[PDB]
């Protein structure tokens, strides 16, 4: 059968390792399985709300890039909320139409009353897209900067 205790030795006689027993044929082993010894040996071995309420009118954003050396400026209107716009780097493998030859990355900045503005980065790593590291959001002038 499929039980690991039943096996075939080099001699070819059947043998139950669970009971340490030898049987001449299959019927003797099956009669041993119904016996007290095999049952006792087996008994011994037995032991969402914020995403749906977000308004999307998709206004026209104003991004200004500048090649620095040692940084993009996004002009956004007044949102009147404490939620800062967040930037994140994603891949071009997921799209609404999935165009061919998409093997680059895109850093996109998104806010709640405005639409996300995305910029493609052909380079591998030239900066850091972390939010708390190299980003700033002045709510007095409503200016977003990321370097």
């Amino acid at each position: 059968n499929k039980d690991p205790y039943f096996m075939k030795n080099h001699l070819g006689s059947y043998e139950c390792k669970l009971c340490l027993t030898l049987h001449n044929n299959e019927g003797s082993y099956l009669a041993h399985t119904q016996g007290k010894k095999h049952q006792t040996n087996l008994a011994r071995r037995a032991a969402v709300e914020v995403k749906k309420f977000v308004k999307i009118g998709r206004p026209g954003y104003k991004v200004t890039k500048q090649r620095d050396s040692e940084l993009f400026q996004i002009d956004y209107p007044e949102i009147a909320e404490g939620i800062m716009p967040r930037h994140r780097f994603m891949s071009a493998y997921e799209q609404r139409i999935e165009p061919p030859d998409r093997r680059w990355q895109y850093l996109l900045m998104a806010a709640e009353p405005y639409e996300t503005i995305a910029f493609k980065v052909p380079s591998r790593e030239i900066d850091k897209a972390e939010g708390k590291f190299w980003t700033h959001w002045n709510r007095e002038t409503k200016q977003f900067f990321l370097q």
Binding site: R88, F89, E130, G131, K132
Partner: peptide
């Protein structure tokens, strides 16, 4: 410390 470091580690 916060979820931003966890998102940066997952990214």
């Amino acid at each position: 410390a916060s979820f931003d470091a966890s998102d940066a580690a997952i990214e």
